[PDB]
Design a protein around this nucleic acid. Sequence first.
DNA 1: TTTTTTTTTTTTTTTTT
Lengths: 102, 100, 107, 107
Amino acid sequence: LERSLNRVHLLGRVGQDPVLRQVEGKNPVTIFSLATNEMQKTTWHRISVFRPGLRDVAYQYVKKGSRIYLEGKIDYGEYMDKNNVRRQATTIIADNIIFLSD
Amino acid sequence: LERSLNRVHLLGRVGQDPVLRQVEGKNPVTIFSLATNEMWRSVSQKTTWHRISVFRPGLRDVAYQYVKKGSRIYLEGKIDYGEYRQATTIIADNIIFLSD
Amino acid sequence: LERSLNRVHLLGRVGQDPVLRQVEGKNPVTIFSLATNEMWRSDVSQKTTWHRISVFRPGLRDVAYQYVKKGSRIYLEGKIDYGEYMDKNNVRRQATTIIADNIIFLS
Amino acid sequence: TSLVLERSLNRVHLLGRVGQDPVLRNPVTIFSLATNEMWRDVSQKTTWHRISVFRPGLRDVAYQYVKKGSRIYLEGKIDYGEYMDKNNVRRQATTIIADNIIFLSDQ
DNA sequence: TTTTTTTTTTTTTTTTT
Ligand code: NA
């Protein structure tokens, strides 16, 4: 079968402290938000880190205000809202993170 | 002042012929869909559908004229979440034709 | 009563199209940048000195705004001025300019 | 190392009074020179130039014979001494790098 | 869902002890 490509790279600033989500059914995931600012037009990205090891590094060292570079893939995710309606959410699943500030 | 990066690279198959729209108060904008696939087992393919927008003058003409249903292309651009809810789109600034 | 001398002569290449700066309370002035380049062989190195040129004199100010262009080669003469301005934080800063009183077009 | 390709000119001529005794700082002899313009009662505008003498030999001549209140003629080139301050903002430290000095009188 | 932070796009090439 022919192959495809789905890769993203981002460089920006973290909006809030990361959170480590553990759902009884599923693997743990580190979640945080990343702003990429054109200069002001700000784009807010939802980052997910599933990969073991990087997930814990991200949870330990990513902080509010941190500048980071990351690489990953785009995922158009799904969730049920409070009314149990099938919703759409986009996340960047990161597989490499480089820390850029102290 | 401080610089950011927001770049996407996609390579996949176009879903339908492109169309011309007004988007974000700008027009014309050339819109089409692109599928990228991943192999999974435990074989089968997970298809990710991307909404591609071409705002750039000239390139939007190229996209409308030459991108076709079932075309294979490589493209580059930036992510815009098209919020109002989300309507995520890849705003393309580079397109390489591979096969039709 | 004793007299001084403050003269500079430059021959070089213009870096950008000139601007006619007009400020409330001030005389108009034509501004542009001039590079004086030195190329040296040991393989070939370059040293570029970038000068800020101001033209206040009427007539020459308008000739300079009309005919000085990015990339133009020119000879000029003038005097050195260590000008003062204030940044956003109200700190006194220095900006050097060559106040030109003669310009000869070479290209 | 010799000059090649398109040539430029960067030459300053000053005549004025030395402000303080020169000091030693690639050793370099440094001093200040005042050039004055008359303006209209009758007032003066003083321009203070930072003189650097890098050239061997002449740097020692300057340190030995240039004194506070000396009147001199000098020639050289402008160097803007660009650098980065604490916040990565470009600053100037303009200096006239002198290569010819003619003594006129001292106090 | 709310949220982040601040180093940045000037020159030419017919010729030189
Ligand atoms: Na700054």
